[PDB]
Design a protein around this ligand. Sequence first.
Ligand SMILES: Nc1nc2c(ncn2[C@@H]2O[C@H](COP(=O)(O)OP(=O)(O)O)[C@@H](O)[C@H]2O)c(=O)[nH]1
Ligand SMILES: [Mg+2]
Length: 169
Amino acid sequence: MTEYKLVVVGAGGVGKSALTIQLIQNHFVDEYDPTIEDSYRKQVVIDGETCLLDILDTGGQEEYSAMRDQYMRTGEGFLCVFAINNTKSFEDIHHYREQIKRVKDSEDVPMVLVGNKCDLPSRTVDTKQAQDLARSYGIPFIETSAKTRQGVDDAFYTLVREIRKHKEK
Ligand SMILES: Nc1nc2c(ncn2[C@@H]2O[C@H](COP(=O)(O)OP(=O)(O)O)[C@@H](O)[C@H]2O)c(=O)[nH]1
Ligand SMILES: [Mg+2]
C-alpha cells in the first residue's frame, strides 16, 4: 500500500543499526550486526493503514557514502539518533540536520529526535536537554533502547505519522 522512505542518521556507535535491526527482524537469524550501510524493509499497520517501510541505515559522517546525497533526496523522513551517554553524539545532531536541510532545501522535513540507550542508569544527556533541542527544530523527541526494545516501534511509527502530517499540510 502506502510506501514510506525512512533514513536513520547519527554518529557512529549510537545504535542506528541496532534500532533498525530490532524493528525489521523476523528473527529467522539469531544475531545480525551489520557494519555497512544497507536498506531494510518492513510491512506494518499504522492507524489502520498498511505501510511498507523502506529503512536506510546510514553510516556516520566518517564512513564515505557515494549515494549519501541521493539517499537524503529520496528520504521522506529522518530519525536523528544520539546516545544518551555520549554528549558528542548529541552535539553532532546539528551537523546531521544541516546536511538534510542542505540537500532538501527545506527547514520543514519530517524528523524525529531519538535518544537511544535509555536502558543505562548512567546518562550524560538529560531529557530536558534533548526535549529543548527537539523544540528548537519543531520535531518530536523519543527515548529508545534497542536492548529492552523500549520505544523502538514508537520511534519509527512516530516518524511515519510525522510524514503523514507533513503530506497533508
Ligand atoms: N546499552 C545499550 N547499548 C546499545 C543500545 N543500542 C546499541 N547499543 C550498543 O552500541 C554499540 C553500537 O551499536 P550499533 O548498532 O553498531 O550503532 P551504530 O554505529 O549507530 O549502527 C553496540 O555494541 C551495541 O551493542 C542500547 O539501546 N542500549
Ligand atoms: Mg551501524
